Design an enzyme around this catalytic site. Structure first.
Site, mmCIF file in Angstrom:
data_model
loop_
_atom_site.group_PDB
_atom_site.id
_atom_site.type_symbol
_atom_site.label_atom_id
_atom_site.label_comp_id
_atom_site.label_asym_id
_atom_site.label_seq_id
_atom_site.Cartn_x
_atom_site.Cartn_y
_atom_site.Cartn_z
ATOM 1 C CE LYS A 64 19.879 81.143 26.612
ATOM 2 N NZ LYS A 64 19.097 81.361 25.356
ATOM 3 C CE1 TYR A 119 19.030 77.196 22.340
ATOM 4 C CE2 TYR A 119 20.857 78.724 22.640
ATOM 5 C CZ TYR A 119 19.597 78.297 22.961
ATOM 6 O OH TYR A 119 18.919 78.980 23.914
ATOM 7 C CG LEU A 121 20.984 78.547 17.344
ATOM 8 C CD1 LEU A 121 22.344 79.254 17.283
ATOM 9 C CD2 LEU A 121 19.999 79.506 17.908
ATOM 10 C CB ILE A 138 12.331 79.806 18.673
ATOM 11 C CG1 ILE A 138 13.245 80.441 19.575
ATOM 12 C CG2 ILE A 138 11.636 80.866 17.911
ATOM 13 C CD1 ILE A 138 12.863 81.601 20.451
ATOM 14 C CG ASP A 172 15.625 75.707 26.791
ATOM 15 O OD1 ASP A 172 16.279 76.750 26.595
ATOM 16 O OD2 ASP A 172 14.534 75.456 26.247
ATOM 17 C CG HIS A 239 24.386 86.292 14.644
ATOM 18 N ND1 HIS A 239 25.207 87.390 14.410
ATOM 19 C CD2 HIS A 239 23.756 86.546 15.822
ATOM 20 C CE1 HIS A 239 25.068 88.256 15.392
ATOM 21 N NE2 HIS A 239 24.191 87.768 16.267
ATOM 22 C CD1 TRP A 334 21.318 86.653 25.256
ATOM 23 C CD2 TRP A 334 23.491 87.088 24.938
ATOM 24 N NE1 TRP A 334 21.860 85.624 24.531
ATOM 25 C CE2 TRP A 334 23.192 85.865 24.326
ATOM 26 C CE3 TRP A 334 24.802 87.565 24.875
ATOM 27 C CZ2 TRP A 334 24.149 85.101 23.655
ATOM 28 C CZ3 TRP A 334 25.768 86.802 24.201
ATOM 29 C CH2 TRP A 334 25.430 85.586 23.605
ATOM 30 C CB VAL A 337 16.183 84.743 17.618
ATOM 31 C CG1 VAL A 337 17.549 84.238 17.912
ATOM 32 C CG2 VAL A 337 15.175 83.948 18.405
#
Lengths: 377, 377
Positions: A64, A119, A121, A138, A172, A239, A334, A337
């Site tokens: 990022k 996301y 996630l 990922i 992205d 998270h 930051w 993962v």
């Protein structure tokens, strides 16, 4: 340097013995001076390949700030504009609000994660993103960047652009924007705009050198577990749900370039990007460089919990006390993962980098807290 | 690993402290396992750029084993032959004995340094080589390889081929030979025959990346001094007259490819070459590999003083006791005037390499002894 190294190694020896960490590379620089630069443990536990200072790592979100810098470099040249609609470059990326209407999404909304995008996630299996087949970058999927963006564009925004903050696939999206504005594939654009200018020779999106990598492991009993393509690893409390990992993703030429999660690099290369961000040695106009490091979202965003805002490159520390940290106001931070964590305490002229092959210990586990506290002692 | 690292590090800290070394990269491998791979000091003291494990070095004579391997690969394929006359490829290379006759000069004669040829460094200013303007390949001259060889061939041999041993420009001669046999410039040939198959990706003859190099300094008090083109530096007792250095040579596309002194490379690349020599995993046919590592000259040659002979790639230790070393019989060793030293103690499966930016401490000063002794400590 010797007192700091003593404390950091003590933390590292404990985490290694406790089988909480397989291997890592950590560097601490102060005002450009390297105070600590050490490889720890193993890169490939099974082969018994020790970690090295220049071992390559799959960066995840550490990608990022690097990709964000490329965007800012284009902004500085006028090839992009902070207030410009994303549709100028991605004519079809027109996500809608829950009521069906289409709002304006600027380069600004995207860099700050205030566009309303999310996301997979955030909610995981069974969610809207899960139904639309949206990838977080990922895993390894059999489709390109344009396809993923089309799937993403068909999901409703969580809120109107600028009315909130949510970690997302905005980088992205910006990756595709960079390709259009530049006319080059993302890797070539990033290389031209950031890597090359900064001397980062050991980074990219697709590598042909597996022997140089830190093999990914994930937290586990009675020892971390070697990752394989397809492993879904539950995320820690508060998270998100989980992350599906694809360690081979980095060696597959067909894996689309992920602006928010798909680069690899060495610790020295990442440090180069962080030092550029920290000291801005004429890399970006000063006003743009200041805006990029300033909180553009609000402490109310609680990006890493209370006390944390967010700029154009990462979280920004607005309140040390609410955040429960010895870091100074204005600290940039930051992670990734795959088990990474970094921060630039601007007031101290400090750049602290932690790259690991253990998800999520190296990202949010106690390891990160102990190393941070050791640097402050 | 830990105890070795502590001992090696103590030696390095003392050398840096005493200003006998600006920067270095040392690697120790045993039976293929890297035990120590550490960068020390600075690559560019004046710019404050630290040494990195992947820093590029002008190899000087560390080029020989690499070029020697290229020659040997062509021999294995039947492109060259150990007893074939140099004239089969270099019709005009016809050096003469003091007698006036043209003795046969074979590939074996050149590889072993028994052809009768020499170097300008043997006698320096005033010498025969000086009169003929023969270059040793470290300086920058405005003529190509063929011209240097034409000047070389016009000098008389010091003795009859095979009659004795004497360090020489033979690998430079072989460099030309290789170009003829392959129909490719030396850089391409070496890359094809050696670098590509051994995965040596950071070596060559001409580089355009100065920021990656270790900056050349020569011994001095208070501290080593940065070298510029054309300066002459007296060799230590028993090593010849002096060397004329041209640090810019590596960046000049018109600098002729010197088979005995003209390549650059990282420490890893050199380790790749040393390891291929040590372990020969199908790189050269067994008999040829054995011949190359075997003494072809005799202890009498005293290539590195008493107890040392020479094979096809370096000196070969015949008598540890006479050589006053803890290294085992069969040990291979050589160096480079830029400040390098390496050795392969075959019996212990050891490959030890030291690349530095300090001529001549890194080649022959106490540093080399102190590291050798720490390894065997």
């Amino acid at each position: 340097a010797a007192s700091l190294a003593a404390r950091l190694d003590a933390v590292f020896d404990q985490a290694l013995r406790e089988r909480r960490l397989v291997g890592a590379v950590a560097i601490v620089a102060r005002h450009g001076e390297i105070l600590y630069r050490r490889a720890q443990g193993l890169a490939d536990r099974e082969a018994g390949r020790p970690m090295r200072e220049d071992t390559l790592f799959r960066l995840a979100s550490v990608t990022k700030p690097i990709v964000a810098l490329a965007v800012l470099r284009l902004v500085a040249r006028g090839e992009l504009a902070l207030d410009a609609p994303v549709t100028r470059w991605l004519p079809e990326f027109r996500p809608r609000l829950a009521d069906g209407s289409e709002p304006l999404v600027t380069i600004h909304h995207l860099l700050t994660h205030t566009s309303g995008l999310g996301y997979w996630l955030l909610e995981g299996a069974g969610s809207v993103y899960d139904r639309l087949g949206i990838s977080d970058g990922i895993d390894l999927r059999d489709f390109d960047l344009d396809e993923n963006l089309r799937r993403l564009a068909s999901a409703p925004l969580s809120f109107a652009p600028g009315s909130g903050w949510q970690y997302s696939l905005a980088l992205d999206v910006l990756g595709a924007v960079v390709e259009r504005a530049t006319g080059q594939p993302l890797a070539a654009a990033v290389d031209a705009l950031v890597a090359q200018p900064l001397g980062m020779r050991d980074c990219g999106f697709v590598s042909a050198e597996p022997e140089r990598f830190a093999v990914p492991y994930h937290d586990g009993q009675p020892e971390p577990v070697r990752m394989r393509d397809g492993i879904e690893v539950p995320l820690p409390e508060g998270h998100g749900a989980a992350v599906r990992f694809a360690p081979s993703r980095v060696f597959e030429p067909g894996a689309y370039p992920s602006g928010g999660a798909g680069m690899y690099g060495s610790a020295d290369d990442v440090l180069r990007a962080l030092e550029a961000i920290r000291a801005n040695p004429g890399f970006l106009p000063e006003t743009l460089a200041d805006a990029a490091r300033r909180d553009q979202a609000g402490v109310g965003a609680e990006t890493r919990g209370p006390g944390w805002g967010f700029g154009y490159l990462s979280a920004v520390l607005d309140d040390p006390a609410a955040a429960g940290t010895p870091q100074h106001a204005g600290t940039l931070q930051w992670g990734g993962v795959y088990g990474h964590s970094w921060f630039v305490d601007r007031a101290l002229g400090l750049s602290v980098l932690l790259l690991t092959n253990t998800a999520y210990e190296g990202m949010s586990g106690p390891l990160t807290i102990a190393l941070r506290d050791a640097v402050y002692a």
